[model samples]
Target: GSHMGESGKIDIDTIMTGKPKSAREKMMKIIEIIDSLAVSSECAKVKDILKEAQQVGIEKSNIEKLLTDMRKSGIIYEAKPECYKKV
Candidate 1:
């Protein structure tokens, strides 16, 4: 399964400090966002994540493909329709 770092703590500064380069990196970034934002079922929107991915130079299609692949592999799950999380 694909993984970023450990989720032992939520370090906003460390997470948002750098940009990702590829689809896997982008997905890991999204996982970091989810770790930060998922405080009682409030997931960061997929649209919002896509925007972040774009800011980091990843295309939306690539991000979507990563998300779908993660879902299929049981590495991530959709908490809400269009929202995602590591499972």
Candidate 2:
């Protein structure tokens, strides 16, 4: 099995302060907004996170790719259909 669960973890605050220049980096940034706007442990909604990602100039396509990749990799999980939370 993959060992990412033990090898690393996201520092949502630090990533929030960063200027991402890559796909993975963009994913980190996306995670931050979800962190901030969580609904009492329910995490975030898609429509809102999309608006925030675009505010930072990350496009919808890239957001989709990163979001899907993270979900696929166990980095983030969908809590309520279009809503998500970090795992």
Candidate 3:
């Protein structure tokens, strides 16, 4: 007879939902998207970034914090009020 113990694997959704991305990762993603926008415009507004980030599974609330962090770190710059550009 063969017997199996409870599975050791953890649920992906639990980890994914609870885990936060690193600052570097967030900054890189923001820069990548903003760079893409460079072809169409010189800067990106918070709304645009928020919209794009939503597609990548980032929540709007989290994005607000990430954008704030980006600004604090100088990874992004505001071209005008409520707009941003990667430096």
lDDT, residue 11, candidate 3: 35
TM match of model 3 to true structure? 0.65
The lDDT, on a scale of 0 to 1, for candidate 3 is 0.73
In angstroms, the error of model 3 at 26 is 2.8
Per-residue lDDT value at 23 in model 3 = 47
The top-ranked prediction according to lDDT is: 2
Q: Each model's TM-score?
A: 0.59, 0.68, 0.65
TM-score of candidate 2 against the unseen true structure: 0.68
Which ranges in model 1 have alpha carbons more than 4 Å from their true place?
1-27, 39-41
Residue-level lDDT of model 3, residues 1-87, one tens digit each, is: 297564245333444476655544665677787777665877888788888988877889888887787778777777777778876
- Model 3: residues with Cα > 4 Å off, grouped in runs: 1-23
Q: How many pairs of residues collide in model 1?
A: 0
Alpha-carbon deviation at 48 in model 1, angstroms: 1.2
| Between candidates 1 and 2, the TM-score winner | 2
Which candidate tops TM-score? Answer: 2
